[PDB]
Each structure stands twice: as C-alpha cells, then as structure tokens.
Design a protein around this ligand. Structure first.
Ligand SMILES: [Cl-]
Ligand SMILES: [Cl-]
Ligand SMILES: [Cl-]
Ligand SMILES: [Cl-]
Ligand SMILES: [Cl-]
Ligand SMILES: [Cl-]
Ligand SMILES: [Cl-]
Ligand SMILES: [Cl-]
Ligand SMILES: [Cl-]
Ligand SMILES: [Cl-]
Ligand SMILES: [Cl-]
Ligand SMILES: [Cl-]
Ligand SMILES: [Zn+2]
Ligand SMILES: [Zn+2]
Ligand SMILES: [Zn+2]
Ligand SMILES: [Zn+2]
Ligand SMILES: [Zn+2]
Ligand SMILES: [Zn+2]
Ligand SMILES: [Zn+2]
Ligand SMILES: [Zn+2]
Ligand SMILES: [Zn+2]
Ligand SMILES: [Zn+2]
Ligand SMILES: [Zn+2]
Ligand SMILES: [Zn+2]
Ligand SMILES: [Zn+2]
Ligand SMILES: [Zn+2]
Ligand SMILES: [Zn+2]
Ligand SMILES: [Zn+2]
Ligand SMILES: [Zn+2]
Ligand SMILES: [Zn+2]
Ligand SMILES: [Zn+2]
Ligand SMILES: [Zn+2]
Ligand SMILES: [Zn+2]
Ligand SMILES: [Zn+2]
Ligand SMILES: [Zn+2]
Ligand SMILES: [Zn+2]
Ligand SMILES: [Zn+2]
Ligand SMILES: [Zn+2]
Ligand SMILES: [Zn+2]
Ligand SMILES: [Zn+2]
Ligand SMILES: [Zn+2]
Ligand SMILES: [Zn+2]
Ligand SMILES: [Zn+2]
Ligand SMILES: [Zn+2]
Ligand SMILES: [Zn+2]
Ligand SMILES: [Zn+2]
Ligand SMILES: [Zn+2]
Ligand SMILES: [Zn+2]
Lengths: 166, 166, 166, 166, 166, 166, 166, 166, 166, 166, 166, 166
C-alpha cells in the first residue's frame, strides 16, 4: 500500500523522532500540494471555471492553514520544519509538472483527487506513528487533517461523477 | 545597480514580452519571498517574538495576495506563470538557506529588509518595462507593490533602529 | 388539476377547519420535501455538484423555515400539527424513494422541480381555502411561500435549460 | 446495558462495515430525535415556555448539524445514508408519539433527557466500533457528539432539579 | 363581538375615511399598549422575571415599530395621527391602572394576553375596513400586525400553560 | 384618471396576459424612473445637495431592486421582460429630458414626486389586474411597491413643504 | 428661575424621598418629551425634512433610553415610577398641543429647544437634590442626561442659526 | 451599619492611603464574589437553570471586568493589588462554603443578593473615602460599580419575588 | 483597430474636451453594457445558470459602480453626462437585441466577452486621451476600469474553455 | 497660476529633493486644512448645520488620513516631515483666522472650496514634480489625493448652488 | 505645584468663566499633545517600533476624541474654542521641538509621559474649577480624561520599566 | 518525572473516579494559574509591557475558558468541582507569591513557562487516566488543552530566546 511505502520512507532516515519525521514530511507535501492547487487555480479553462477557480482558493487557504499548524506543531515538539522551496520540492512525495492551459477540467479534478488521496494516506501514517509514540496532540492534528482530506475527496469525486473510492 | 541587473536578466531570454517576463520574474520572487518570511515566522527566537511572529503572517498574507494578483495579471495579458516549486526556486533571484533557530532577531530583520529591497528594485524594473511597453494596468500593479514594499522597508528599518536607506 | 385534487383531499376528512387542514397538509409535505432535498444533497454525483450541493442546503434551510412558520401558524390558529415522522410520511402527498448514487444530476433537478410544483399547487389550495375562510394572515403565509416556490421553479428549470412551465 | 443492545442491533445485519452501520443508525436516530425536539418546540405549554421554546430550536440546529455531518461522513467512507422518512422511522430505535398539548413541561424535559441518553449510548457504540475498525476520523465525530450529548443531559437534568445520572 | 364594537366605535365619528379612522385608533391603542408593556417591564416581581423583563423590551420595540409604521401610513394616505399623550389616553379603548409591585407574574401575563387580543381584534376591523375601501397597502399593514399579535398571544398563552384560545 | 389610462394602455395590445403586460410595463417604467433619479443625483445644484445626492442613490437602489424583482416575477410567470434601453424608452410612459445643471432643487423634487405618483398609479393598475386574474403573488409585489412609492411621495412632498396629496 | 420652580414643585408633595420624586418627575417629563419629538417626526413639513425626520428618531431613541434608565433607577432605589399615560400627562411640566401640519420647521426646532432646556433644568434640580441626599449613582445619571441635553440644545440652536443661550 | 464596619476595617491597618486600601479590599472581595458566582453557575439545580446558568456567566464577566479595572486603578494611583488566591481569601469579607448540589435555586439567589449588597456597601465606603481624599477618578469607578451592583440587586430580588430592599 | 475607430469617433464632434468626450462615451456604453448584462441575468437557460445568474448581478454591480464614478468624474471636471435612456442608446457603440430565451449559455458568454473587449478598448482610448490632455485622475480611473475589464475577459474566456485572446 | 507659484515656492529652498519638498509642503497644508475644517465643524451656525457638522468630521478624517500617508511617504523616501504646530503654521500657504460664530454657512462653504482648490493645485504640483523625478509611488499618492479633492470641490460647489469651476 | 501654576495661568486673563478658560486651555494643549504624539509616530526608530508606532495612532485617536469633546463642551456652555494652529501653539503650555530621527525610544517614552503628566495636572485644575463653579457635566468630562491620562501614564511608565510615580 | 508525581498525587485519595480526580485537580490548578497570569498582567514593568500586558489577558481568557470547560465536564460526568478560593489554593500544585513590581520581564516569562509546563504535565496525566478509564470525551478535552499549553510554551520560550525544551 501507499501507507506502508510512506511509513517506510518517513522512518528510513529520541522518543518522538518518527512523529517529527512524519510532521516534516507533511510540511514538504502540504507545500507542494498548495503549489499544485495554485496551478489549477491559474491554468484551468473550461465550463465550471467560475466556481472551480474560487474553490481552489478555498482549498489553498485550508492547505496553508494545515501547513502552518503542522509546522508549528513540529517546532513545538522539538523539531525543525523544512522552510525552503528546494527542501519542499526534494522531500515531497508529490510531483509537479509545468503548467499548461491545455489540461482539461477533468484532468485538474483527477489531479486534485490524487493529491488529497496522497495526503490522506500520509495522515494515516501520521496516525499510526503518533499512536505508536504516544503523541495524542499530533494524533488529533492528523485525525482532523485526514477527515477534511477525505471529505474533500468525496466532494471532488462527486464533481467528477464518481464515488469517493477512498 | 541591482535595477540594471534585474532588467538585463529579465529581458535576456510580441508587444508585451518584457512585461510578461517581469511579471513572471515576480511570480518566482514572490513565491521565494513568502517562503523566506515563513522561515522567520517559524525559526525566530528572541525578545519581540510575540509581535514579530504575527507580523510575519501579515507580511506573508500580503506577499501571497501580491503573488495571486501578479500571476492572474500575467495570465490576463496572455502569459503563463511559473506554477511549480522547482520553477520558483530556479528562476527567483532570491536565495534561501536552511532554517536554523540560532539566527538572531536582528539577522531575521536584516534578511527581510534585503528581501523587500530586492522586491522594490524588481518592481522598479516592472515600472520601466511597463512604461516602455505601454501597459498602464501592469504599471499600476507594480506601482502599488513598490509603494507597499518601500513602506515595509521603512518600518522594518525603524524596528532595527535605522533609517529607510532605500 | 392537481389543485382540485389537493383541495378534495385536504377537505375530505369550526370556522377555520379547512385552513387548519391545509396548513397541516403543508406540515407533512414540507417535512417530506426537506427529506427529498437532503437526499439530493447527499446522493448527487456529476459536474455541478460543487454549487448544487450547497444550493440544496439553502433550499433545505428555506423549507425548514417554511415548516416552522406553517406549523406555528397552525398552532396559533388553534390546530395541532403533525409532529412525528410516521405522520409526515403517511399524510404527505409526496413520495420518497431509497437514495441511490446512480441518479443523474438531471434526474435530481427534475425531481426538485416536481416537488416545488407540488408545493406551489398546495399553496394555491391554501390561498383558495384561506380566502374562503377569511384568514388573511394564513393567506399571506401561503402567498409568500407560493411566490418563493414559483421563483425556485423558474431557477431550477433554467438550470435544466428549460422555461418555468408553471 | 443499552450499549450492548445497540451494538448487537447495529452489527446484526468489508473493513469498515460496522462503522458504516453505526453511522447509518445515527442518521435514522438523529432524524427521529430532531422530530421529537420539534414536537416539544411546538406542543409545550407551561411556565418557562419562553426560554424553553427557543432552546428547542438550538437543540434542533445542533441535531441537524450532527445529522448532516454523520451522513456526509458515512458517504465519505463509502456508505449510503438513509434518506427517506420511512427509513428513519423504521430503523431508528427512538419511538415517537402523536403530539398533544397536555404533556407537562416536566414530561417534555424527561423525554429530551431520554433522547440524549439514548444518543450518548449510541455514540459510545460508535466509539467502540470505530476503535475496533481503526476509523479515527469517525471516532472523533462520535467523541464530540457524545461529549455534547452528555453536556446537554447535564443541563436538561439541572433544569429538572436533578443530577446528570448519566 | 369586540370586532363589531370596535368597528361601530371607529366609524361612528372621503374615499378612505374609515381606513384613516381605524389607523388613528391603532395610533392611540399602540401607544397605550406600549405604556402597559412598560409597566410590566418595571413592576414585575416573581420567578421568571429575568427572561420576562427583557421579553417586555422586545414586545415594546415591536409595538413602537408598529406605532411609527401605522402613524406614517396614516400621514401618507392623507390623515393626521394622534400625537399627544392626552389624545392617546382619551381615544384608546385600552385602560391603564396605576402600577403596583404586588401584581403576580400570572396577572401580568393575563393582562398582556388581553392587550394583544384587543389589538388583534382591532386589526381585524382594520382588515374589514381596508378591504371595503380598497386600500391594499394598509390591509397588508394590518395583516402583518394581526399575524404577529396572534403569534404573540399563542406564546404568552403557552407561558401561562394555556392554549391560544384566540 | 391616470389609473384608467394606464389600464387602457397596458391591456390594449392566456390566463395571466394582463398581469404579464402590467409587469412588463413596470419593467420599462422602473428603468426610466431609475434613469431620471440618476439624472437628479448628477445634475442637482443647491443647498441640501449633500443629503439629497446620497438620498438619490437610496431611491435608485430601491428602484433597481424593484426592477429585478418585477422582471424575475414576469419571467417566473411565463413572460418575457423588456431588456434593452430602446424597449424601456419606447414602452415607458415616463418622459425624460436632457440633463441640465440649471434645474432648481425644487424642480428636481417636483419631478421625483411626479415619477412616484406615476409609479403608484401603475402599481394600482397592477393591483386591479392581478386581483382580476387571481395572481396573489404578483398582487403582493405590487402592494409592497405601491406602499413604498406612497411613503416616498409623502417624504418628498414633506421636503417640498407640502402634504402627500396622493 | 425655572430650576427653583421645578425644585419647589418636585419637593412640595425617608432618606431619599426627594431623589425619588425628582426621578419620577423625569419619568413623566421624558414620556411627554418623547411624545412631542414624535409629533415633530410626523407633522414636519419643509426643506430639511429628509435629515430632520430621521434626526427625530435618534432624539426619540435617546429619550426612551433615558426613560427606561431613570425609571429603573427609581425602582432600584425603592420608588415606584409613573407607568400610565394619564400619570405622565398630569405630572409632566411639559405641555402638548394637537399636531398640525402647518407648523414651520423653525417652530418645531424652537419647541425642541424649549423641551431640552426644560429637561436640562429638571436635571440640574436632580443634581442639587442627589447631592443633598448623597445619591452619587443618581447624580451621575442626571449629570450624563444634563450633558447630553445641553449638547442637544447647542446643536438644535445651531441648526436655527443661534448660539446655545443655555 | 455594614458601611461603618467596612470603613473601620479598611482604614484600621500618604495622601491616598485610604483610597488604596479600599481599592485593595475590592480586589479581594471581587475575586471572592467571582468565585461564589461561579459556584452558583456550576452547582445550581432546579427550574430556571437554563436562563440562570448563563446569567451567572454574565455576572461573572462583569465582576471580572470590575476586578481588572479596580486593580489597574489601584496600580495607577501607586498601590499594589492582592494578586494571589490566599490573599483574596484572607482579606475578603465574603465567606465561601464548599459547593453542594442540594442548595435550592432560592438559596443561590439569596446568596447572590447578599454578595451584591455587600459589594454595594463596600462601594459606598469607596465613595466616602475617595470624596474625603479628593480622588475623583476612583470615586467615579466606585459610583459606576455601586450603581450596577444596585441594579443587579433590584433584578435578582425581582426574580425572588421581592422588592430591592437596598 | 477598434481603438483607432473609438478615438476617431469620440473626438469627431477647452483643455480637457477630449477627456470629457471619452468619459461621456463611457457613460453611454456602461449604461448599455449594464442593460446587456441584465438581459443575460434574466434570459439565460442552461446548466450553470445557478452560478452564472448571480455572477451577472456581480458584473452588473461593478458596471453600475463604474457608471456612477465615470459620470461623477465627468461632472467634476466640468462636463455634462448623458442622463437619459435615449442618449445612452444613441451614443453607445454597443448594440442591443431583443431578449430571447433560446440563446445558449455559450452565446451569452461570447456576448459578454465582446462587451468587455469593447469596454477595454474604450478605456485604452481613455488612457491615450487623458495622457495627451494631462488628466492623471481620469487616467487612473480608466486604468482601473481597463484592468478590471481585462481580468473579467480572462475569467469569462476561461469559463468558455478559451484563453484571454485580449 | 497658483500651480506655478506653488511650484516656485516649493522648489525655491539629491535625486528626489523636489518630491520631498512638495510632500513636506503637503504635510504643513494638510495640517492647516484640518484645523480650518475643524473650525467650521465648531463655529458653524445656520440651517443645514445638522448634516454639515458631521460632514466636517468626514472631511477631517480624510484630511488626517491624507496627512499620515503623505508624511509616512515622505519618511519612507528619506525625508523628514514637519511635526510641530509652529512648522505647519509657518510653512503652510493656507491662512487661518480666529473662529467666530457670525460667519454664515455660505462663508464656511466658500472657505472650504478655497481650501480644496488650493490642495488640488498643490497636488498638481506634486504630480509635475513626481513625474519629473520619476517617483511613481508618490505620483499615485498625489493623483488619488487630487481626484478626491476635485470630487470634494464638485460636491461643496453643488451645495453652494454652483458648478465645480475647478 | 504644576497644578497651582496651571490654575494661576488659566484664571489670570460670568458664572462659568473659569470653566470656559480651563476648557480652552485643554483645546490648545490637546492640540499640541496630538502633534507631539504624531511626531513620535513618525520619527521613532528602535526595537519595539512595530508595536509602539501603532500605539501612537491609538493615543492620537483618543487625544483627538478628547479635543472634539472638550471643544464642543466649551461651545455648548457658551464659550469660543481656539481653532487655529497659531492659537494652539501660543496658548498651549506644552513645548514642541523639531522632529529628529536620532531621539531614542526611551526619549520618546519619557516625553509622552511628561505630556500625559501635564494633561492630568491640567485636568485636575479642570476638576477644581468645575467644582468651584458647579459645572457637573464639565467636571465629569475632566474626571474621565484625567482617569484615562493616569492609566496611560501607568502603562507608558511600565513600558519604561518604571512605576507610575504620578 | 512530574507526570508520575502528579498521577501518584491525584490518585492517592466507581468507574471514573480517577478521571474525576484529575479533572478536579485541573479545576484547582487552572484557578491558580489564572491568578498567577493576572499577577503578571498587573505587576510587570519593563520594555515589552505594551504587548505582554494584553497578551496576559489573552492567556487569562483561555485559562478561564479551560476552567469552565473542565469544571462543567467534571459536573457532567458525575463529579463535584472545587468552587472556593481556599479549595483552589489548598489543592493546587502551583504555588503563588506576593506580587512585587521588582520582578523582571524575564522572571515573569520564566514563571509562565513553568506554569504551562506544569499544566501540560497535568494534562498528560489526564490523558493516561482517561485512556485507562475509557473516557474519550474527557481525553479529547485534555488533548486540546495539552496541545494549546505546549504551543504556548513554544511561544513564551521563543520570546525568552529559547527553544520549547518541553
Ligand atoms: Cl534539501
Ligand atoms: Cl524550471
Ligand atoms: Cl399517522
Ligand atoms: Cl426501510
Ligand atoms: Cl383629545
Ligand atoms: Cl421596442
Ligand atoms: Cl395621576
Ligand atoms: Cl495574605
Ligand atoms: Cl440624444
Ligand atoms: Cl519652522
Ligand atoms: Cl493667538
Ligand atoms: Cl479545602
Ligand atoms: Zn482569481
Ligand atoms: Zn486567487
Ligand atoms: Zn533536504
Ligand atoms: Zn503562529
Ligand atoms: Zn502563522
Ligand atoms: Zn524554468
Ligand atoms: Zn456538505
Ligand atoms: Zn450539508
Ligand atoms: Zn395520521
Ligand atoms: Zn417559535
Ligand atoms: Zn422555531
Ligand atoms: Zn430499511
Ligand atoms: Zn431592564
Ligand atoms: Zn428596559
Ligand atoms: Zn381627541
Ligand atoms: Zn456621489
Ligand atoms: Zn452615486
Ligand atoms: Zn417594443
Ligand atoms: Zn419615518
Ligand atoms: Zn420614524
Ligand atoms: Zn398622579
Ligand atoms: Zn455552562
Ligand atoms: Zn460557563
Ligand atoms: Zn495578606
Ligand atoms: Zn435573480
Ligand atoms: Zn438579480
Ligand atoms: Zn445625443
Ligand atoms: Zn459634533
Ligand atoms: Zn466632531
Ligand atoms: Zn521651518
Ligand atoms: Zn504608520
Ligand atoms: Zn499612522
Ligand atoms: Zn490668542
Ligand atoms: Zn490593562
Ligand atoms: Zn486586563
Ligand atoms: Zn479540600
């Protein structure tokens, strides 16, 4: 599963080391996810743009709220968040591609769903790790982020005419 | 001057090509500037943290508003904004360093001042280019961004006990 | 007509008996209409979900405001509103079907239009009855509810690419 | 205990089947609870009506917020919520009776307390099931709903001159 | 009936003379009703004071909104509203008594119910008269005031443990 | 009377044809009335300008709210509103004159009063027609618009030192 | 002086008897003042109506706030406020006259100034009495009411082209 | 009197020494009063709880606003406020008892009235002392606090069915 | 180009004559543009209506804000704005057609894009003229209006699946 | 012209020296203008006072916002604003006279118009100077201030019954 | 003392002459104090600028609210406030110095404390004078201004690491 | 560890006895913590006071929100919260000292950090106990309080120039 792979990857490289590592992974991934969402906001063309475009700023605002919270939680528990674009891009497991206006609305929606599926799996790894290390506060952070990610998947999937398939 | 160098660099690589290039340069630089500001928000330690920390989120909100406006202006006039972290980091003329908690408040303030001085010079290049190409709307965008950057320099300089020296 | 049939049905089973009966019919029908609208809110899949889904909560809020007003009006004039789910379901003239994700957006819109057409006809019966019995206050309630129902039909019909055909 | 009986009943009829079943049970029960609360709102007579009546709309608003959240959570995790009045009434473990103006304020308060005691027990079953199946997000939903139900029991009990006895 | 008596009295002493007379009667009666409500606000003693006291200011605000609207409507249609305390007190059909702290909460509630019953009957006379004279705008004013008066009767009656008996 | 003439004119050129015609007449007249009000807003000179000028924007906002409501009501009941400036100007019974700064404040006030007197008479025709055709919803629309027009006449007349003379 | 006469009159008919008497005098006078202000609100005709009319509702709101505060203060200190229109009209030292549309704006302004001059003198008597009886709380109430009355005199006088002459 | 005893006690142990002592006495007493009010908020059982419980938080918010103001005033005039729970409890003249759920609503109301009667007497001592020492600013603070305390006594007494008896 | 033609047309028929002429041209064109937008608001049918319909009121509000600003600017600089529907319709370079429900959503979007392209070209003429005549304030007005028009073109084009092509 | 004289005067006594001088001139003049406006606010007597008086506080608020912006802009670009009353009064080109209550409303309006005409001419000098020295940000500041000054002239002139004559 | 000297000075040059003189002294001093505060706002450099700078605008807003209130009180009681910068500067007992960026934060804080100490002493003189002349309303104005000045001294002193020493 | 000691102490003296004991311990400790925070609010002197002082009221508001929630949770689950100052002071594990103005800002910050470290350890004990006893609702309460305490430690530590060291 992606969850096993994320776990393996996060814990490859102190009592809360794995929690710090998974939080930092989320710093990088939230930063890349925000960049991807912004790309949709800007490059989208097609019917529905007029409600999808502002929807991207709502998703963006939430991703950025997640980022600040995750990173401040990481600092709070004695870690050191990635804090440069090169660190985000190297450590994130999300890929980016050059923006192009010729992607269809359907392609943007599928990409967003993949981003949120990835984030929900990362957060599940965050749940497992924080349970193992006994960090209830960070577990609650990951629980809320996963729950919101899953709801977002359901809604984007619905917009695509599909079930949540999460 | 930095202004001459930015101009040379922007126009090194259609009736509004240079305006599009300078806007895109601003996309990259605003993105890196936001990242730098976030790093201060997170890594700062020292007396004054309790008002400087939320001040960074205000600066961040403004930089991100600038970014969206600049990028949508670029799209509007027929360009294609950078829209990945790797593009921001490669094309930006701002450098980033790994976050460290041992930077002093004075070092963070000096870094912010350098970022805003850089942005104000970039915007001056934007003014020259948009005047040359007759893009009044983009000229107004750069005028407001420069004016706000300059005010920010004055205030950060004041916090450092210095004059604006812009 | 549906109006004749609703009238016949309402008045089949005191100076304001028919007004009380038509108000109570509206209690049952508003309750079922709200349930139907909620089903669309939940089960819808397809392009447009992202504005249609919150639109259902707006329609729902209005139906529930109608319900409380109608029921309190009924109480106020000396009646006794239905106040259990089994009473709503037995006395309502609206049918419900088990939710299914495979209904198309077009089917949900057609169903909503039928619900509002039904409600507007019920309210017309409410107008006739309250005029006959001289209840100006309840007549005004039905007038506003009918007017809002008719506007809703026009807008939902427009979303379907059709005229109001009311 | 009621908790054992609810569990037995929910799980009588895939990795998250029991979580889906308990969420759907909550759909039905929240719907019936809202109906019961509305009946108090409408039929109550006696000293205190003027603050108890609007209190019922507050309880109602919260029950309806719970309903939408529970049902959207159910959809999100791959289930299918009850979405007709006949399904709510058949599957709910709460009974309803015909409204009557001759119930005393004390009887309405006792009924509300029983409804919330039932809901808190249902949510405890939701906690057990979501812990067993590893659904942290749904566990958090049930935790918050139980906590709010318990607080509501304490306050309604206090209004009756009694301790929470939960 | 009180309605017949109010009508007789109003029309005892131009195309809209009776509408003007009934509006002016409402000026006087709303003014006295407000005074009565204020007396309850001030003189009430007993359990429930803490929600009944502010409830009187809500009733008062509505009565005063009614007064201004009625009086401006009267002016608008070519009449001349009573506009002194002696005119209100002489022409009103409501009686006042000296305030006393020894009235019970039950007595205040009964008095308020009588005031609103009187006002609803006056408004019914306003409905009959405005229908007869073809003043739709003033008819709508009386319809809304009657509907609000009737709702108020239902709620005050409920607080007394009684049905609306309107 | 003007009312007879408006009626004759509206019904000169289906169960609700006259209601549709009178609504469409209101579309044209509201559009011209708004234009006239705007002309006062712009061209007025004289003492009182500083409260009369913003008063024109309030009158304008209300006229435009009326216009949208009337036109959407017309659409809702199966008609087709005028929707070009040439249609408004040809079908409106209100005349316009070229703006001039030499009109006195008194002349602007007299003109506004004539506009509102005209609109109130048109709305009376709307009342008669909607009563005849049994359109309660449109009757309520015209009732509220007439009532507001009449109040506006009273206030503008008062500003002129005159009675409503409606 | 009017102050001597008010004092004589108030104290003509326990440790705080005079404070209670002066507060009750204010109950009656505030009630009559509000009635007078309302009469101006309704009957005024002439240039300036459009800002003077809403100004009367502001003055009215303040007078009614004064009334409630004065009367609740009276209750609080062990008195019994006038609470019927006949008591207000008999005990007030302000006279009322039948409303007439032929009063000029200048006459309304002069009347308001006389009302406020009277109230400020009454409040001065309230200051003297509360100082004599050692009621600091009621003294503060009268101080604020006098200060506001005096400011109102200055502004109304200014509108008349006159100095405060208080 | 209690006032004489408070004075004696306050001034038992510089130009404003007595003002500082009475302010500090208020620090201690406001702190204990807040604790007592909180105890009612938590331990109350009986009809009326649902409006009395939030009423305690309003009383609490005001007591805490008083506390901060009194203590900052004390600091401002050169004193040193009590600032530990042991100082509040030792120096306050209010007694506390262990919370118990078996106190009746009537007992809680009587206790609150005693607390406010005590506070109003303390504030009267504050008035006498600040007058004697010429501290107008602190006199105004005590005047407003006494006036609010007295109003609170009137309202709580009314809820008990009694007059203010202050 | 359209820009050359608008210029030629505006300046065909004092130090700021051309600025006044171009502002007045904008008065006429903004008025016709608003009418066209309203026609879309009313006549549109098809999927997307539910977000496109309110989008038209946003566009309308902005066009009307532009109109008032342009016209007040014209007055301010010594001109005389068109202020009748016949002047708007004769002098505007925008054509209108009778509303019809059979236009597709795509046709409405194309028409809006043409309107905004026209307005942006008119504003460019306004920029050239105000630069030539040295009217910086009016130049700023046209700059902001052009920038907003261009952004609107980009967004409407995106909704059509197209690039801005401005 | 006044513009030539202001220019001569400003530049009588570094790359942005003239921009700094004109900004500082505006510091002094805005300060004196605010003082003049305050004098009207206080000393005015005559019909219209009740809307003109609060209008002066609006003008005052804007002048003070201008002052802070101008002065902070001056600081930002490396200057040193006047910051004492004696500097404002010596360097301002506006004269003040002792307040007197015998100035007519017409005299106050004429004085305000002269103040704003002066300020608009000063801002024109600011435009010329900032264009010459290439300070786009300060040019934008002067453009907005001039545009607002000109609008204010138009409105005050209108209140006087005159055209803008700017 | 400064209080004796202010008194002597104020009363050196009718029943309320001294109250008018002390109010006018406050007009001049508040105006100079505002100017001084503005100078700190602009010229400050040093750590803490970022919270001290906006703190100056808060102090400024309060000083300007004081100024308007004092001056309107003076007008209200029959005086004539200073209303030119030259009058403020001549009659104020506060001195100003040319702004300079080389003042330290500590120097600005000490200066502000001296300004507020001066104002509190002036207000004490206002208290003595208004007590002597029996002007309770103006006494209350000075009491509130003194109390606020004293609190401000305490807080600024605290920022300096000092006690209030008032 | 402190956690072991708190646990030992809490459980030294029914299915949820330990949860009730730890909640009650939090009642006492939150009450003492609030008192300590208030002492800093009042007694602090030194640079930074102007942002640290209001920061204490924010911390205080949160501590008091925690207190009410904890205590109501305790009541809700069948316990009895401490509710007198003597109980808080005896049972709290936090010590208080007499306020003194000579504590440095650094000492206040260190004390606050110790308070929050203590509270976070107490909440960890609350987590362990609620997990052991199966109280998910109280576990969530302690999780949120711990998370907020930890964030507060990070920020206060940062203000001291230190890492969170939690
Ligand atoms: Cl890296
Ligand atoms: Cl690249
Ligand atoms: Cl049934
Ligand atoms: Cl079923
Ligand atoms: Cl009479
Ligand atoms: Cl036509
Ligand atoms: Cl009497
Ligand atoms: Cl002690
Ligand atoms: Cl023409
Ligand atoms: Cl000088
Ligand atoms: Cl002088
Ligand atoms: Cl104890
Ligand atoms: Zn956008
Ligand atoms: Zn955006
Ligand atoms: Zn790395
Ligand atoms: Zn933060
Ligand atoms: Zn942040
Ligand atoms: Zn690249
Ligand atoms: Zn939803
Ligand atoms: Zn929903
Ligand atoms: Zn049945
Ligand atoms: Zn209700
Ligand atoms: Zn309700
Ligand atoms: Zn079933
Ligand atoms: Zn009250
Ligand atoms: Zn009240
Ligand atoms: Zn009479
Ligand atoms: Zn305007
Ligand atoms: Zn306007
Ligand atoms: Zn036609
Ligand atoms: Zn009115
Ligand atoms: Zn009114
Ligand atoms: Zn009497
Ligand atoms: Zn509570
Ligand atoms: Zn509470
Ligand atoms: Zn002690
Ligand atoms: Zn619409
Ligand atoms: Zn619309
Ligand atoms: Zn023409
Ligand atoms: Zn004023
Ligand atoms: Zn003012
Ligand atoms: Zn100088
Ligand atoms: Zn600033
Ligand atoms: Zn500022
Ligand atoms: Zn002088
Ligand atoms: Zn404070
Ligand atoms: Zn505080
Ligand atoms: Zn104990």
């Amino acid at each position: 599963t992606l969850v096993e792979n994320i776990y393996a990857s996060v814990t490859h490289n102190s009592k809360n080391e794995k929690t710090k590592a998974v939080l930092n992974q989320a710093v990088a991934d939230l930063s890349v996810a925000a960049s991807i969402v912004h790309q949709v906001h800007w490059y989208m063309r097609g019917p529905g743009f007029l409600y999808l475009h502002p929807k991207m700023d709502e998703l963006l605002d939430s991703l950025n709220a997640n980022l600040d919270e995750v990173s401040e939680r990481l600092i709070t528990i004695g870690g050191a968040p990635y804090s440069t674009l090169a660190e985000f891009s190297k450590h994130s497991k999300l890929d980016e591609a050059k923006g192009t206006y010729d992607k269809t609305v359907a392609q943007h929606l599928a990409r967003l769903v993949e981003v949120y599926l990835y984030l929900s799996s990362l957060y599940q790894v965050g749940l497992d790790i924080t349970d193992e290390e006994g960090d209830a506060g960070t577990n609650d952070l990951f629980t809320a982020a996963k729950t919101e990610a899953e709801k977002t998947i359901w809604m984007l999937q619905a917009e695509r005419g599909q079930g949540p398939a999460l």
